[PDB]
Design a protein around this ligand. Structure first.
Ligand SMILES: Nc1nc2c(ncn2[C@@H]2O[C@H](COP(=O)(O)OP(=O)(O)O)[C@@H](O)[C@H]2O)c(=O)[nH]1
Ligand SMILES: [Mg+2]
Length: 272
């Protein structure tokens, strides 16, 4: 409840974004003791913030996940990024104003979007122009971690090849994703960040039910077998989960404050 971290999920509707939010919170909020299914989630039509307290080791922190409406459902989707871009810049503006005030708060509320999870449809080809355009715009103002939505849609071979095509599109379009190579501070950071970089975009699966096996809580998605979403042999959600821990959260925030928010300040100076 001290250290704050804000994640936004972004992507077209029907990619399992709202589902993965619930999966992520459950993956970091321990629960001992029954076989239960999840309720159906309505289509997300408004930007909404979901905040829960989570504990790592024994230290508490406030995790906020921002759910967003879909884009790309229309014939013409020009400027469909504006509501999300507006939200992001609004948080920067709030923080800036709190910071510049003469009688500022002793503890400034940080509602800045520290990272965006960008959901890519599991098409099997390459990145769509819309998603390229949206991620490009986002990457200029916020940390981006792309993910393959509903990765259970892909065989392993399809997944490997799809990742190569997506990475090629990101790189050829100059879309920097977290962790950016230029921000590696030392050799240990490099070795850790290389593994993340090689795995991005993460093949994730969202859970629709939980149970317990041999004392261990399993977050799972049903199929005509059960996908254990935290099993690294089933999908890569666990790697995403592990990226979103105390130490890397801090590095993500550090880039948000020192790179993106600082860039925003410069923008506000070049305007007035
Ligand atoms: N196959 C598959 N379906 C999923 C996954 N995650 C969610 N779903 C289903 O996809 C549908 C849309 O989920 P939702 O979270 O509302 O997607 P959103 O519109 O992006 O927020 C729901 O019926 C979910 O049960 C997944 O990882 N794989
Ligand atoms: Mg949704």
């Amino acid at each position: 409840q001290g250290f704050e971290f804000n994640i936004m999920v972004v992507g077209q509707s029907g990619l399992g974004k709202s589902t993965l939010i619930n999966t992520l919170f459950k993956s970091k909020i321990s629960r001992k003791s029954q076989p239960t299914s999840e309720e159906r989630i309505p289509k997300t039509i408004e930007i909404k913030s979901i905040t829960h307290d989570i504990e790592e080791k024994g230290v508490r922190m406030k995790l906020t996940v921002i759910d967003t409406p879909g884009f790309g459902d229309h014939i013409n989707n020009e400027n469909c990024w504006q509501p999300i871009m507006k939200f992001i810049n609004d948080q920067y503006e709030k923080y800036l104003q709190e910071e510049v005030n003469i009688n500022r708060k002793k503890r400034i509320p940080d509602t800045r979007v520290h990272c965006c999870l960008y959901f890519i449809p599991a098409t099997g080809h390459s990145l769509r122009p819309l998603d390229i355009e949206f991620m490009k715009r986002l990457s200029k103002v916020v940390n981006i971690v792309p993910v393959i939505a509903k990765a259970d849609t892909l065989t392993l071979e399809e997944r490997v090849h799809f990742k190569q095509r997506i990475t090629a599109d990101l790189l050829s379009n100059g879309i920097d994703v977290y962790p950016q190579k230029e921000f590696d501070e030392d050799s240990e950071d490099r070795l850790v960040n290389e593994k993340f970089r090689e795995m991005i975009p993460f093949a994730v699966v969202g859970s629709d039910h939980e149970y317990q096996v041999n004392g261990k809580r399993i977050l799972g998605r049903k199929t005509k077998g059960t996908i254990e979403v935290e099993n690294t042999t089933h999908c890569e959600f666990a790697y995403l989960r592990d990226l979103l821990i105390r130490t890397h959260m801090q590095n993500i925030k550090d880039i948000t404050s020192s790179i993106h928010f600082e860039a925003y300040r410069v923008k506000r100076l070049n305007e007035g």
